[PDB]
Design a protein around this ligand. Sequence first.
Ligand code: ZN
Ligand code: ZN
Length: 78
Amino acid sequence: GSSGSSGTEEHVGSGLECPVCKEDYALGESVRQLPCNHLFHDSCIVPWLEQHDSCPVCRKSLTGQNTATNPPGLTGVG
Ligand SMILES: [Zn+2]
Ligand SMILES: [Zn+2]
């Protein structure tokens, strides 16, 4: 009958679609991984962390040292 398998690699394409838009990834699509084991589109997270600086899913504090930390961009930012 039907014989064949591939598996579930870290980033192969298994329910890993970006949560920000809930669409999907792409070999060429620049993806970003979080310290909480959560990936996100380099175009969905970039503009996110620069506003919340956390995970849009679990919001896992992406900082441990003192508050004094390099800014996401320029004072202008909200
Ligand atoms: Zn996205
Ligand atoms: Zn997370």
